[PDB]
Amino acid sequence: TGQVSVEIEWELQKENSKRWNPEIQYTSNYAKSANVDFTVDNNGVYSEPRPIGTRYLTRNL
Amino acid sequence: TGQVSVEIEWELQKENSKRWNPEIQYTSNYAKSANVDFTVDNNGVYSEPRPIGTRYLTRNL
Amino acid sequence: DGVGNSSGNWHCDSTWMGDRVITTSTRTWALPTYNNHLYKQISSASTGASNDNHYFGYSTPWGYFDFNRFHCHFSPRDWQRLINNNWGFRPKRLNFKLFNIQVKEVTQNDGTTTIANNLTSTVQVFTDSEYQLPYVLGSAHQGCLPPFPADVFMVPQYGYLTLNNGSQAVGRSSFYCLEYFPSQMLRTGNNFTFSYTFEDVPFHSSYAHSQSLDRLMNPLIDQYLYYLSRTNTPSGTTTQSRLQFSQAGASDIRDQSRNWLPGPCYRQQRVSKTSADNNNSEYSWTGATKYHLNGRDSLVNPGPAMASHKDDEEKFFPQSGVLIFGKQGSEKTNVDIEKVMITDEEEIRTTNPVATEQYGSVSTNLQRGNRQAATADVNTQGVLPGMVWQDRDVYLQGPIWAKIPHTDGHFHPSPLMGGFGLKHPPPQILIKNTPVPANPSTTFSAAKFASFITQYSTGQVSVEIEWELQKENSKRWNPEIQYTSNYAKSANVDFTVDNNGVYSEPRPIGTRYLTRNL
Amino acid sequence: VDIEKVMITDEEEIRTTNPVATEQYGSVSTNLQRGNRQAATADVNTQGVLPGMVWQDRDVYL
Amino acid sequence: DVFMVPQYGYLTLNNGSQAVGRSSFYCLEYFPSQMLRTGNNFTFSYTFEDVPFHSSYAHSQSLDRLMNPLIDQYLYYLSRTNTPSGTTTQSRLQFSQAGASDIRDQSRNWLPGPCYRQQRVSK
Amino acid sequence: DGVGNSSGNWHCDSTWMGDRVITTSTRT
Amino acid sequence: WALPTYNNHLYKQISSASTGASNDNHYFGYSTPWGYFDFNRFHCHFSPRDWQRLINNNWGF
Amino acid sequence: TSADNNNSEYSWTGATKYHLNGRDSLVNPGPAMASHKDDEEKFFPQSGVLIFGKQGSEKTN
């Protein structure tokens, strides 16, 4: 047994957008729930509720 | 008549948050609509649909 | 600087220097106020449009300058000096000016019209150099600088389309307020300039080819490769199957081995300039060649670059496959074939397939001898390794460049209408009259002004493009084909005004005359 | 496992450029017309790359 | 969470269940290894070669609609192949000029991406 | 300075820089 | 991590023989005593919060 | 094998052709593709392979 440690450095491209109205963003629903999403449950099991894509921000074709 | 120009410089305090699960964010609804919000209409009138508060991100009390 | 000084000189000249050529042109423009200074959304709602025809977008008070056609920068004489002597050309450097701006008030009070200057009022101009705005200049719209330098043109209105579902907006649709960008406010006595450098782009090819992709061989010598000449023999008083192999030479010129393949194809329907040879049904939309994107199909124009017709038949052309220009004074809707001038791509058939014909044939099944061999025809062919093709031709009346969409992938960015694909094109230049309010009421009110002074502005615009040339070096003995004006007498010289002052261009002029070895 | 036990990704942000997976690419003229013969078209199910095509790569997920 | 390290294995050329004979065999013991004991550690660093940015944006406008809806094109297309003239239909080619009225008929510089078609099923 | 010269340009842009942000707006 | 001994320190060949597999399903290969580290999924390197901080603010990475 | 082939003359008609400027020519050798499947060594594509002559091979048939 042992420990493993991975470290990745990522380069980002920042959004520069002149649109007037607001973007679509990724948000967690604010309504009440028996279990917070992306969280353990009372038995200790971690679950991911839905897949999360990478494209929300919009840009001119 | 004439032109008026105001320029304000703001200082920001960046979010540093170690929570695991995702934040609540401000988002425009992605469903289709006859009029995009925060946009002019076919007569040229600009309207703001709802008030937008400043507090979404969360922090430990 | 002042009211009495002049902002700039008229330079329309061109200088041919060395392998460079520098073309310059100046025009006079007039800018109305569009929309009454209002941003409005536009759509296909209430129109009763078919699913293919729906759109959603915004129209703006702004207007824009479009120099994106060749005859803006070239006279007919400078164009044949270009295409007769040169194998290729590309744009290098650009320069732009607005000067001698004049704003003018209008007065309808008496029922007469009354016009006076306004020395104080301004006009605001910004160039979009970071490419945040939707780029409209690549769609071959009207409103470009006039062909003939003596003409005054009206600056076209700016507007754009965004995502729609039916007539409704999607919600990922975006809205741009052009007032939200830094502008330069010009008053009479102020001028506006900027310069732009094109990134490295391939030379356009002004040559044709001297020899077809079929015939690259030496006809005298024979190949050392074999092919399958005969599958059966008369031997035995009846036919029996025996494979013979033969060696390919001028006797059978079609059977040789070759290193290269013709370019790709997306097939078109064939129509004839002769009214009698066409079918009597309406196939215009139903028999068309379409692509299907997001549940709505649109027509393919002009499409991938393909030859117009075979050797013999000049009258046939592909339905959607060619660029069609109108003659001077041609109406918008349902004009007869005599009112339009149809381009002819036939110089390109050395490599590219014919638009109306099939690409080839392909074996359908395996044969045994209880089963004969069968083939099927290939109407659509994507790129294969070892294919060579030519881009579509450039015309004096046609577009210079297009903007390459910003996407994860694209293949051979050359635009389909012809011209130079550019990741960063020449920026858009947007211009607008600054609103001047009519007298407000003396008591205060928070509603915005619906009343303005009626006014418009005029001025001078000057565009200067530097082109790089590739000179012809050709060792052929006999003379080239050149572009020539017919020497016979005529009531009107071509590319010339008539007795009423109207300038007309008789026929489209392609860029490829000189020939070169494939 | 039943469809409730799996989470299916949705690529619909990409349909600005790329075609819909289940739909045809387009239609293409099959034959030459004369006027003893009407024009006919056939549908293109498979399309390889042509010059002047633009597309988006598939999306990245957590 | 604690995870168990997965086993390494590979496939090579086969004809049926049998090997081809151009199939290869690799003994991993045949490579230089670093032998670690409790109190030893192992590190290495790696630099990615230049690769395109992934695209986290969507698009604001479809490849169909890149046009200015207000202005009209100067190119023509073939609008009508026949005429009612003559109390019966006869073949005459008319050409029209494309604008917001007919938005599907305009000339365009670009084509959609490629396709390899799938069968459709419903949730 | 004069009648024919312009007194100032239209700047409506905003720049997000570092922890600073600078917003600018012009009106008539 | 925890690493068992696989195969009892033996290289073995594996195949679809005796399984009665269709022609599409045949294979031939080798399994080894070794094991390997796989960090090739994104949620190894990102929390759900660091992922929406990524995708909401950035055009590319 | 001479017996497994069909008795008709398909040499040109059953061939794989491309059509350029109103005249169709044969594709040789064509794009690079495998000659045969795993089992069957005797089959080869009609126009798809390079065919060399042995020393002292005549020109025709």
Curated annotation (Swiss-Prot), chain F:
Biotechnological exploitation: AAV capsids serve as viral gene transfer vectors that have been shown to affect long-term gene expression and disease correction with low toxicity in animal models, and are well tolerated in human clinical trials.
Cellular localization per UniProt: Virion; Host nucleus, Host nucleolus
Free-text domain note: The N-terminus of VP1 is sequestered within the mature capsid. It contains a phospholipase A2-like region and putative nuclear localization signals.
Its job: Capsid protein self-assembles to form an icosahedral capsid with a T=1 symmetry, about 22 nm in diameter, and consisting of 60 copies of three size variants of the capsid protein VP1, VP2 and VP3 which differ in their N-terminus. The capsid encapsulates the genomic ssDNA. Binds to host cell heparan sulfate and uses host ITGA5-ITGB1 as coreceptor on the cell surface to provide virion attachment to target cell. This attachment induces virion internalization predominantly through clathrin-dependent endocytosis.
Protein family per UniProt: Belongs to the parvoviridae capsid protein family.
Misc remark: The ratio at which VP1, VP2 and VP3 proteins are synthesized in vivo is about 1:1:10, which is the same as in the mature virus particle.
Protein name: Capsid protein VP1
Span covered, complete protein: 219 to 246 of 735
